[PDB]
Design a binder for this molecule. Structure first.
Ligand SMILES: CCCCCCCCCCCCCC(=O)OC[C@H](COP(=O)(O)OCC(O)COP(=O)(O)OC[C@@H](COC(=O)CCCCCCCCCCCCC)OC(=O)CCCCCCCCCCCCC)OC(=O)CCCCCCCCCCCCC
Ligand SMILES: CCCCCCCCCCCCCC(=O)OC[C@H](COP(=O)(O)OCC(O)COP(=O)(O)OC[C@@H](COC(=O)CCCCCCCCCCCCC)OC(=O)CCCCCCCCCCCCC)OC(=O)CCCCCCCCCCCCC
Ligand code: BCL
Ligand code: BCL
Ligand SMILES: CC[C@H]1c2cc3[nH]c4c(c3C)C(=O)[C@H](C(=O)OC)c4c3nc(cc4[nH]c(cc(n2)[C@@H]1C)c(C(C)=O)c4C)[C@@H](C)[C@@H]3CCC(=O)OC/C=C(\C)CCC[C@H](C)CCC[C@H](C)CCCC(C)C
Ligand SMILES: COC(C)(C)C/C=C/C(C)=C/C=C/C(C=O)=C/C=C/C(C)=C/C=C/C=C(C)/C=C/C=C(\C)CC/C=C(C)/C=C/C=C(\C)C(=O)O
Ligand SMILES: COC(C)(C)C/C=C/C(C)=C/C=C/C(C=O)=C/C=C/C(C)=C/C=C/C=C(C)/C=C/C=C(\C)CC/C=C(C)/C=C/C=C(\C)C(=O)O
Ligand SMILES: COC(C)(C)C/C=C/C(C)=C/C=C/C(C)=C/C=C/C(C)=C/C=C\C=C(C)\C=C\C=C(C)\C=C\C=C(C)\C=C\CC(C)(C)OC
Ligand SMILES: CCCCCCCCCCCCO[C@@H]1O[C@H](CO)[C@@H](O[C@H]2O[C@H](CO)[C@@H](O)[C@H](O)[C@H]2O)[C@H](O)[C@H]1O
Ligand SMILES: CCCCCCCCCCCCO[C@@H]1O[C@H](CO)[C@@H](O[C@H]2O[C@H](CO)[C@@H](O)[C@H](O)[C@H]2O)[C@H](O)[C@H]1O
Ligand SMILES: CCCCCCCCCCCCO[C@@H]1O[C@H](CO)[C@@H](O[C@H]2O[C@H](CO)[C@@H](O)[C@H](O)[C@H]2O)[C@H](O)[C@H]1O
Ligand SMILES: CCCCCCCCCCCCO[C@@H]1O[C@H](CO)[C@@H](O[C@H]2O[C@H](CO)[C@@H](O)[C@H](O)[C@H]2O)[C@H](O)[C@H]1O
Ligand SMILES: [Fe+3]
Lengths: 62, 273, 48, 39, 315, 71, 60, 39, 60, 39, 60, 39, 60, 39, 71, 40, 60
């Protein structure tokens, strides 16, 4: 059977794929304000491309 | 590149040393005089780390180990291959970490912010300086510092703990752990409350300060307030590092027995001796 | 062991914590606390 | 809250339920006693 | 400071409102049916632990206070495996563990119901669920290795004795990679709350602590917070998303921790040797060298049963 | 006696009552299940004169041992 | 007795009841499965006279 | 909330569903008792 | 003597009393169950002449 | 709060319920003493 | 019986039911896969009378 | 909310799905029983 | 002496007094129960001439 | 807020209850003494 | 001397005094109870001549070579 | 407010009498303790 | 010298004085009680010649 592969190594690479997926998600959220960037060469999005600006609705008292 | 609101803020002023000479940006990064000294110390220290890896047995990231000198060298600078290289890197680290804190102060001054962030980071520098400067100096040899290696420093932590037989019994360590655990709970709690008012279930109005105040009061039985939770988080996180610095500096310089037998004073209080 | 023989009750510890003999009883030698460490003698009334 | 005659009504069920529960518990104990007495 | 306001009629429209936010009652500290049951079950757990601790010093109330941090309610003996143990030998332990576990789950329900009643997102009960997950691995890992003896004793210093002995038994927990990750998130949680607490206090003069307003209607306090970190380290969050970084770093502490415990004794029995296999262990020069006769002489025995007799040696 | 329900909200009382009865019944069943004489799942088929008596010794079993054999 | 559903919303009671019964059934199954006599997955094929029995009264 | 006749209607299902479930459990215990009795 | 209930809210005094007595009853039963002489679940069927006593046997 | 006669009514139940409970506990001790005297 | 779907949102019920069945099915498969008798990935091809059976009563 | 006509419609599929699932499980159990009985 | 109740609210005094007395009585009973001489639950039947006594002076 | 009249009235019960408590404690001590003297 | 009660609240000093006296009384009893000479709950029935006494200076050379306990 | 001087005299008279009465019973307690087991 | 009580408030100082004396007295009693020479609760009835004395210089 597989000698070098073991369940703790499998679990750890599963976590790494999840974790890099999470960092990408968080960096998208970080770009909902202040983006796209201004630059002398024109607008810039960096990477990953940001999520859009988000509009909030407030509880109607009328 | 700049944030869509940024250009307005990029004024001169607020520097500490360099005047206008280094008062510029490089991409997103502010430079300033302590930017220059930061990159100097970062580059020198990193290349000496890579040299320590090159003369060591392997390039495996986890196994690289730049160790301090033997205790016989006392407070002298050892031969570089015998641990003097660790001593140079330690000076570079102190230069980098100090430069980073002073650079943050220039950035806060330029933005009209309070100095809270530099001083909070000072709590981490204090703990590092305790491990590699103050405790080794009080023990009388730089060789008491921890080795620079991703797992070899965990071997050092392990062996230092067992130098006192049962390090869990260290009373300052118990406090420091309690701060670390309470901080993580408080961070989960504050993070969840802000997100859950700003992201209510679909088809629900955006929440309010009053709602998070109501819920928080149900959780802890008192209302902390918006500034109070940030004071608490800063107190817990920085207090953890300060009590960490205390718990290691008392181990060796001041206490040298097992930590369990420190508790003998409690068993001998005269009301129940 | 093949089988278990109970010790006399006076040799049975009240405190089941495994490290107590090193973490506490090496340093604690108060007389009253030392007595509490084991169960006291206990005899059927007709055997007295 | 609750009115007095409405409390009287509820009390009658509480008495009845408590009695029925104590009856079942009494049979349960006497079964257990007949199986393996504790005195 | 030192110009406090005091509000006589009810704030929320010192004192507090009695009223409703829709389904949610305001005023008393909310329990509901799940909160009441949680306190009943949890109280019985606390009572069983304390009465067992107090019985272990022979009911002596002076020794109960004097020795308190050394007192334990201790798990069953190993040879019972998962079978029910004698009451004095871990039967009370499993009973306290059961009521504590129910009490925790009922408290989670109480928090989950309250979040929904206040019309709030579900973020807090899922954060608490991460902590409960780690807690439950102190049941599931003893279950997976097949003995309740491996459970954590209830007691201040005794549970720290267990924590050390667990790392010893499984060959140094520093080399468990999920323990290492859990520490990275624990430290990162302190890094983030230091940075964030200091950031908001540094802009509190400009109304930065009104974070919900700063999220819905970005002020200069938010802009300065973003620019400080962008200028310092080259990237930044937002006033909202910094709370997502916070949330995930706290949650991942106990989540990665729980996986590390579940793997221990089930998949890996010696984490240092797993570290050697996978290349984690830095080499040191040998401190001693055994001869082939010593390799047989210095192997011991695995620890067995305690002697159940008092031998005489009459000779 | 019915005026007790005017002093206490029955909606609150019933939850506390059910909770008290739940913990009490569970405590007693776990106590008996851990006893020698009444561990009915293992030994319930024994006749009354075959069941343990007087087995009150605090350490009836060895405290220290390996785990049972894994397979 | 139907007026009990005026004190307690049956929508809520039914979910709590189903949750209670789920936990109770799991507890009872798990208690039996970890016994010797009723470890039915490993030993369920034994006849009633072959099934384990706890120890008799010692010291007869 | 509920009208009394709506509570009355629910109570019928609730009693019948409870007693039905107790009947099924009674049969499961008949089967278990036949396979391996506990007294 | 009844004016004690003008001074205190009986709605609270009864809860405190019931909670106190419940805890006290639990403590006393636990203390007895932990003893040897009154370990009644294991030894309740012993007659009082052969129930345990906290004394050492004469002449060993 | 309570009126004075409303307190006087409560006191009647409270006293009688206390003495009732003490009477039940007295018989419990009579039975315990008959089973296994503690002095 | 159908009126249960007016008392509860069928969207939440079906998510609850799928969640329950997924967890329960996974638990039961792991309990069996952990057993000796039913560790089918390793021993599934054994005949019924060659599959493991747990310990019987101590007749000797 | 939902109409009672929608609930009656939905219930028909929910019952049919439950029955189909129970049937597939019953075949799965009898296959497993034939391969390796647990009683 | 009754003017003392003008200076202190008996609502406050009696709660403090009852709390003090209950705690003190419990402490005293448990101090006695854990002693050798007064461990009455195990040894209450002994009779005074054969109850334990703490050791007389080592100089004996 | 006590009146002097209420304070006088309350004090009579407080003295009486204290005397009753001391009397019971005195009998309890003499029972304990005659069973197992502590001097 | 009575003017001290103009200087301090006579209501509050009483609470401070009783609290102090209660703590001091408890402390002295528990100090005595943990001692050997005054562990009165175990040894109160001993006469004063036979109650324990703490160790004494040997009043001699502290040097005289021992002799074994008689077999 | 505060304490009026005729009230302070009344309070002082009680307070001193109570203090001395406490010391008197403590004196008898030491008389009994000394005759049971003297500490010098 | 009574002009010193125009500088410092008697209310503040008399509290601070009583506090300091009480702490100092208690520290000294416990220091003495912990010593061998003056452990007077155990050894108070020993004569002055019988009481312990710390080790002298041997000078040899
Ligand atoms: C990616 C595809 C695969 C994916 C799967 C695997 C990776 C998953 C993570 C992907 C994350 C995004 C990566 C990325 O491309 O980022 C671009 C962005 C730059 O900002 P932007 O807004 O997006 O763009 C603006 C820019 O494009 C235009 O403006 P300007 O022209 O002025 O900018 C100059 C540019 C030049 O661009 C670069 O130089 C990119 C440099 C990326 C470095 C990444 C190194 C990672 C390996 C390090 C190994 C170590 C070397 C020593 O921008 C900059 O000046 C760079 C500003 C960022 C400086 C980052 C400093 C280090 C960050 C932490 C490093 C890790 C520490 C453990 O930079 C960042 O945001 C980086 C920092 C964000 C991640 C921090 C995560 C920390 C996690 C710590 C917990 C670890 C627990 C175990
Ligand atoms: C190994 C794990 C160890 C660990 C194992 C244990 C872990 C257990 C964790 C359970 C977490 C559930 C959280 C939860 O449900 O919270 C909301 C809800 C209260 O909600 P509310 O907002 O305040 O009130 C309204 C309420 O009605 C919810 O309304 P919603 O709009 O959400 O709509 C419906 C429900 C889904 O409901 C249903 O599915 C009910 C269907 C009833 C059918 C009746 C039969 C009809 C005939 C059949 C027709 C034919 C077709 C079927 O919303 C939901 O989605 C929430 C979840 C519902 C499921 C509750 C949990 C049941 C499963 C437990 C599984 C245990 C583990 C397998 O809470 C509750 O009602 C209480 C939850 C159950 C707690 C039981 C008590 C705890 C155990 C005590 C043990 C005592 C000692 C033995
Ligand atoms: C010699 C000792 C071992 C060791 C043994 C262990 C063991 C064993 C464990 C850890 C675990 C952890 N260790 Mg380690 N650890 C060592 C060295 C370290 C060092 C260090 C600098 O050397 C650090 C920083 C850490 C850090 C950490 C954490 C990252 C992690 C716990 C996360 C957490 O939040 O737990 C705290 C949070 C909880 C326990 C969750 C609690 C949630 C519940 C729901 C709360 C209920 C409260 C209840 C209702 C209150 C009433 C209770 C009654 C009073 C009883 N370890 C060495 C190598 N460590 C854990 C882990 O995850 O391992 C992978 C773990 O189990
Ligand atoms: C308001 C009343 C006065 C008072 C008025 C008197 C009078 C008058 C006489 C004494 C006498 C005595 N008092 Mg004076 N005494 C007071 C307070 C005290 C306090 C105290 C703690 O405050 C103490 C310790 C004493 C102690 C004493 C004794 C030393 C002495 C002998 C009698 C005795 O045994 O009384 C035992 C009683 C106690 C220890 C406590 C209770 C004190 C009671 C309230 C005093 C009045 C009763 C009186 C003694 C009755 C007999 C004499 C009558 C004139 C017939 N009194 C108060 C402040 N006392 C007598 C004396 O000196 O004889 C030579 C005496 O003639
Ligand atoms: C993300 C990981 C971190 C985390 C998160 C976290 N913990 C949480 C939460 C979150 C997000 C909660 O929402 C939850 C909470 O409620 O917080 C206030 C909780 C919580 N974390 C807790 C503890 C805790 N968390 C820890 C750790 C962590 N928590 C991690 C670091 C630790 C550690 C480090 O060991 C501990 C000890 C609790 C304070 C709380 C859960 C409380 C709970 O479940 O209580 C159950 C009930 C009892 C224990 C019973 C109490 C009994 C009373 C004292 C009796 C009084 C008498 C009673 C009135 C009688 C009954 C009469 C009835 C009629 C009422
Ligand atoms: C270590 O020691 C150990 C070993 C532990 C040993 C020590 C053990 C100890 C200390 C035990 C103590 C036991 C004890 C006390 O203390 C025990 C006290 C128990 C009690 C009080 C039980 C009471 C039960 C009552 C029940 C079940 C009532 C049910 C009522 C029902 C069903 C009807 C509901 C009403 C309806 C339906 C009407 C609605 C109408 C409406 C709305 C309308 O009409 O409007
Ligand atoms: C190691 O040492 C160790 C071993 C520990 C040694 C120990 C040492 C020590 C330091 C012991 C200390 C003991 C002590 C002090 O110091 C002890 C002090 C004890 C005291 C003070 C007891 C007092 C009890 C008084 C009672 C019970 C009163 C009851 C009153 C009742 C019932 C009436 C209520 C009012 C009514 C009905 C009228 C309402 C009308 C109203 C409202 C109206 O009319 O308006
Ligand atoms: C009279 O009242 C008194 C004075 C006694 C009250 C005072 C009480 C006091 C002083 C109490 C003190 C308590 C202390 C100090 C407690 C300390 C606790 C600590 C530090 C605990 C730390 C860790 C414990 C852990 C992780 C325990 C985990 C246990 C678990 C997960 C058990 C689960 C059990 C389950 C789920 C089920 C068991 C029953 C089964 C299903 C197996 O059936 C038999
Ligand atoms: C919960 C019912 C589902 C089956 C549960 C298992 C029990 C099996 C026997 C079911 C026999 C029929 O069961 C019977 O169904 C009828 C409707 O048909 C229910 O009838 C209920 O609702 C109807 C209206 O719909 C009311 O008029 C009636 O007063 C009320 O009791 C009864 O409460 C139940 O007793
Ligand atoms: C609403 C109430 C519902 C529950 C009611 C339960 C009432 C129970 C009453 C128990 C009465 C016991 O009645 C009888 O008591 C006598 C002593 O008097 C016991 O007598 C026997 O045991 C005792 C103690 O071991 C010996 O001292 C004695 O010599 C011996 O004869 C009997 O064993 C018992 O049968
Ligand atoms: C198991 C048997 C032993 C335990 C017995 C427990 C129950 C008590 C037994 C006596 C029952 C009758 O007890 C008596 O009840 C009446 C009401 O009926 C109470 O009467 C109370 O309320 C009534 C109005 O309802 C007032 O007018 C009256 O002034 C007041 O005292 C008495 O205060 C109580 O003494
Ligand atoms: C349990 C106790 C056993 C040991 C004995 C204790 C003895 C206690 C002695 C109490 C003597 C009381 O004697 C005396 O009482 C009167 C009121 O009656 C108090 O008199 C006080 O109030 C009156 C007004 O009524 C003022 O005018 C007076 O200036 C003031 O001192 C005295 O302060 C006290 O000295
Ligand atoms: Fe914030």
């Amino acid at each position: 059977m597989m000698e070098y592969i073991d369940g703790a190594q499998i679990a750890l690479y599963a976590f790494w794929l999840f974790f890099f997926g999470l960092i990408i998600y968080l960096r998208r959220e970080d770009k909902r304000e202040g983006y796209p960037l201004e630059s002398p060469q024109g607008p810039r999005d960096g990477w990953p491309k940001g999520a859009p600006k988000k509009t909030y609705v407030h509880r109607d008292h009328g | 590149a700049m944030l869509s609101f940024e250009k307005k803020y990029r004024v001169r002023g607020g520097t500490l040393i360099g005047g206008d000479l280094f008062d510029f940006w490089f991409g997103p990064f502010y430079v300033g005089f302590f930017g220059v000294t930061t990159i100097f110390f970062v580059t020198l220290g990193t290349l000496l780390c890579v040299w320590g890896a090159a003369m060591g047995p392997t390039w495996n990231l986890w196994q690289i180990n730049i160790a301090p000198p033997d205790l016989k060298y006392g407070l002298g600078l050892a031969p570089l291959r015998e641990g003097g290289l660790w001593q140079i890197i330690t000076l570079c680290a102190l230069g980098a970490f100090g430069s980073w804190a002073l650079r943050q102060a220039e950035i806060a001054r330029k933005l009209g912010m309070g100095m809270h962030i530099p001083w909070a980071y000072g709590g981490a520098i204090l703990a590092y300086t305790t491990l590699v400067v103050i405790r080794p100096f009080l023990l009388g040899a730089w060789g008491h510092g921890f080795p620079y290696g991703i797992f070899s420093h965990l071997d050092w932590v392990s062996n230092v703990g067992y130098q006192y037989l049962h390090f869990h019994y260290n009373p300052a360590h118990m406090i420091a752990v309690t701060f670390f655990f309470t901080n993580c709970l408080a961070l989960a709690m504050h993070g969840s409350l802000i997100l859950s008012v700003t992201n209510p279930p679909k088809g629900t109005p955006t929440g309010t300060s009053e709602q998070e105040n109501v819920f928080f009061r149900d959780l802890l039985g008192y209302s902390i307030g918006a500034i109070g939770i940030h004071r608490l988080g800063l107190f817990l996180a920085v207090g953890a590092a300060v009590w960490s610095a205390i718990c290691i500096v008392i181990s060796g310089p001041f206490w040298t027995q097992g930590w369990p037998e420190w508790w003998n004073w409690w068993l001998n209080l005269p009301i129940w001796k | 062991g093949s089988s278990y023989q109970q010790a006399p009750i006076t040799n049975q510890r009240r405190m089941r914590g495994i490290m107590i003999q090193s973490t506490l009883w090496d340093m604690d030698r108060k007389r009253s606390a030392t007595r509490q460490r084991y169960y006291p003698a206990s005899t059927p009334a007709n055997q007295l | 809250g609750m009115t007095e005659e409405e409390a009287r009504r509820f009390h009658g069920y509480m008495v009845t339920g408590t009695l029925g529960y104590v009856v079942v518990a009494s049979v349960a104990h006497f079964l257990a006693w007949s199986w393996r007495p504790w005195f | 400071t030192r110009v406090q306001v005091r509000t006589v009629p009810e704030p929320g429209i010192f004192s507090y409102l009695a009223g409703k936010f829709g389904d949610a009652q305001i005023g008393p500290i909310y329990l509901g049916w799940a909160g009441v049951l949680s306190l009943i079950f949890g109280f019985i757990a606390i009572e069983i632990i304390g009465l067992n601790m107090w019985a272990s010093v022979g009911w002596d109330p002076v020794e109960f206070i004097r020795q308190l941090p050394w007192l334990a309610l201790e798990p069953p003996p190993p040879q019972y495996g998962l079978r029910v143990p004698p009451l004095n030998q871990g039967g009370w332990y499993l009973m306290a563990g059961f009521f504590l576990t129910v009490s925790i789950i009922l408290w989670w329900i109480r928090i989950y119901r309250r979040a929904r009643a206040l019309q709030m997102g579900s973020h807090l009960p899922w954060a608490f669920a991460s902590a409960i997950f780690l807690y439950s691995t102190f049941f599931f890992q003893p279950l997976l290795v097949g003995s309740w003896s491996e459970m954590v004793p209830f007691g201040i210093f005794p549970h720290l004795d267990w924590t050390s002995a667990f790392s010893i038994r499984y060959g140094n927990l520093y080399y468990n990679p999920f323990h290492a990750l859990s520490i990275a998130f624990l430290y990162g949680s302190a890094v983030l709350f230091a940075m964030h607490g200091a950031t908001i206090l540094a802009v509190a003069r400009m109304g930065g602590e009104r974070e919900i307003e700063q999220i819905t209607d970005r002020g200069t306090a938010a802009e300065r917070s973003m620019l400080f970190w962008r200028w310092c380290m080259g990237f930044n969050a937002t006033m909202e998303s910094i709370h997502r970084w916070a949330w995930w770093f706290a949650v991942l502490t106990t989540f990665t921790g729980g996986i590390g415990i579940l793997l221990t004794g089930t998949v890996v029995d010696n984490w240092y040797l797993w570290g050697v296999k996978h290349g984690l262990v830095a080499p040191y020069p040998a401190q001693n060298q055994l001869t082939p006769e010593q390799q047989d002489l210095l192997r011991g025995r695995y620890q067995g049963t305690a002697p159940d007799s008092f031998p005489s040696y009459v000779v | 006696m019915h005026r007790i329900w005017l002093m206490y909200d029955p909606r609150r009382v019933m939850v506390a009552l059910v909770g008290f009865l739940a913990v009490l019944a569970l405590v007693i069943h776990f106590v008996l299940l851990s006893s020698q004489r009444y561990s009915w799942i293992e030994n319930g088929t024994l006749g009354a004169d075959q069941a343990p008596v007087g087995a009150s010794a605090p350490a009836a079993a060895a405290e220290m041992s390996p785990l049972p054999p894994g397979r």
